[PDB]
Amino acid sequence: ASAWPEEKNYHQPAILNSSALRQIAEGTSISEMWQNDLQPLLIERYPGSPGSYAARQHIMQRIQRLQADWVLEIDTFLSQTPYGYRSFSNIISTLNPTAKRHLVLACHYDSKYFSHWNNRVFVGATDSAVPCAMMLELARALDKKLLSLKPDLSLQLIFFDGEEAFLHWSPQDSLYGSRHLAAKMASTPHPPGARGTSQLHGMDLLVLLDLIGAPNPTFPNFFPNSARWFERLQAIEHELHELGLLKDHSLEGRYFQNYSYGGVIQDDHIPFLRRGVPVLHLIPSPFPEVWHTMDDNEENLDESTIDNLNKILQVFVLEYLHL
Ligand SMILES: CC(=O)NCCc1c[nH]cn1
Ligand SMILES: [Zn+2]
């Protein structure tokens, strides 16, 4: 009876030296992400809308053009909603599908439904078009390194549909995509042919990005079972800062501070966390001031903060994967 599902508990990062950190900082482009990955998503894209389809096509096309061996799957399903039965489509992009373990980065790609108000449309810039674009830019910036994966551990990206409630949040009206996919993964043997382990046992850590893009975010260290990885984010931020590789950044105003948050925040990680998956929840507290407002738009995004977080996240992923 293999103990491979316990490997995540002992897994250590292979830390990047200064020259490597400079390389990663120089290898990501916030302007290229802005134009090529973010702007196409700054559209109305609630579940079932034409924008949802356009966003899904955009995400798939951007991953498909990369050199690394990404396997794309669209997870389409039905769920009851306040408006009756509807269809949803999660997007899953995986390197090395049969590898037993994967580090998983995720966000939601739907935008919350609002009827147009005074010619304004809700595009959820921080919620979560930026997180989507950050995952796409990470796949692009790290493409050559990721191509080398073509330690039975690889990378998976999940873009969840239906994170938002169609009305105001309620237990049944929210997290459509993640509740569905967590249950599906929990009931899927992994690796292929396994007798008693599932795709959830294979999830080393779920890094969920949400509500990113506003100025001065502060991310709490939510869970004891992922605290050591939160500490790695702190260390990476600190070293990138000291090497002069972050923009308009101070340690007093750092993003990963020493502070927990005992409360519960409902988000896409919940169906995974309640099935035992370790989660690093990259959601700020407090939420952006523009949260669930028509002002959650492009103009209110903080470019340098997103650039800095892209560098931090890319170093984190390379260190985790030993790349
Ligand atoms: C308020 C709460 O507990 N969860 C909502 C988090 C959220 C809203 N939009 C994106 N993420
Ligand atoms: Zn939201």
SS (H, E, C) the chain: CCCHHHHHHHCCCCCCCHHHHHHHHHHCCHHHHHHHHHHHHCCCCCCCCHHHHHHHHHHHHHHHCCCCCCEEEEEEEEECCCCCCEEEEEEEEECCCCCCEEEEEEEECCCCCCCCECCECCCCHHHHHHHHHHHHHHHHHCHHHHHCCCCCEEEEEEEECCCCCCCCCCCCCCCHHHHHHHHHHHCCECCCCCCCCECCCCEEEEEEECCCCCCCCCECCCCHHHHHHHHHHHHHHHHHHHCCCCCCCCCCCCCECCCCCCCCCCCCCHHHHCCCCCEEEECCCCCCCCCCCCCCCHHHCCHHHHHHHHHHHHHHHHHHHCC
From CA 176, how far away is CA 3, in angstroms rounded?
Answer: 32
Q: Are 255 and 309 in contact (CB under 8 A)?
A: yes
| The token pair that represents 315 in the structure block | 């170093």
From CA 92, how far away is CA 106, in angstroms rounded?
Answer: 9
- Cα-trace Rg, the chain: 19
Q: Are 79 and 88 in contact (CB under 8 A)?
A: yes
Measured from CB, residues less than 6 Å from any atom of ligand 1 are: 127, 210-211, 265-267
Q: Are 154 and 105 in contact (CB under 8 A)?
A: no
Q: Are 132 and 184 in contact (CB under 8 A)?
A: no
From CA 283, how far away is CA 295, in angstroms rounded?
Answer: 19
From CA 164, how far away is CA 173, in angstroms rounded?
Answer: 8
Catalytic residues, which ones? Answer: 163, 210
Q: Which residues contact 28 (CB under 8 A, 6 or more apart)?
A: 137, 138, 141, 307, 310, 311, 314
CA atoms within 13 A on the CB side of 86: 18
From CA 154, how far away is CA 156, in angstroms rounded?
Answer: 7
Are β-strands 279-282 and 203-209 bridged in parallel, bridged antiparallel, or unpaired?
A: parallel
Q: Which residues contact 303 (CB under 8 A, 6 or more apart)?
A: 30, 34
What are residue 73's DSSP bridge partners? 92
Q: Are 131 and 209 in contact (CB under 8 A)?
A: yes
From which experimental method does this structure derive?
Answer: X-ray
Q: Are 217 and 206 in contact (CB under 8 A)?
A: no
Characterise 248 by phi-psi region: left (phi > 0), alpha (psi -120 to 50), beta (else): left
Closest approach atom of ligand 1 to CA 127: 10
Length of the chain: 323
Neighbours of ion ligand 2 (CB under 5 A): 127
From CA 160, how far away is CA 109, in angstroms rounded?
Answer: 6
Q: Which residues contact 310 (CB under 8 A, 6 or more apart)?
A: 28, 30, 33, 134, 137, 138, 141
Q: Which residues contact 257 (CB under 8 A, 6 or more apart)?
A: 218, 219, 220
From CA 64, how far away is CA 55, in angstroms rounded?
Answer: 14
Q: CA nearest 143: which of 209, 206, 69?
A: 69
Q: Are 174 and 268 in contact (CB under 8 A)?
A: no
Ligand that lies nearest to the alpha carbon of residue 265, given by its number in the listed order? 1
State which of 169, 209, 292 you would mutate to test the pocket of ligand 1, scoring each by most atoms of that ligand within 8 A of its C-beta.
Answer: 169
State which of 122, 159, 265 you would mutate to test the pocket of ligand 1, scoring each by most atoms of that ligand within 8 A of its C-beta.
Answer: 265
Using the mean position of ligand 1's atoms as its centre, give its distance from the Cα of residue 292 in Å.
9
Chain breaks in the chain (C to N over 2.5 A) after: 150
| The token pair that represents 62 in the structure block | 């951007």
Are β-strands 279-282 and 71-79 bridged in parallel, bridged antiparallel, or unpaired?
A: unpaired
Instruction: Give domain 1-323's CATH superfamily.
Output: Zn peptidases (3.40.630.10)
Q: How many other C-beta atoms lie within 10 A of the C-beta of residue 315?
A: 26
- Integer CA distances (angstroms), 149 to 7, 70, 99, 182, in order: 19, 10, 10, 25
- Integer CA distances (angstroms), 21 to 43, 105, 170, 238, 254, in order: 34, 20, 43, 12, 18
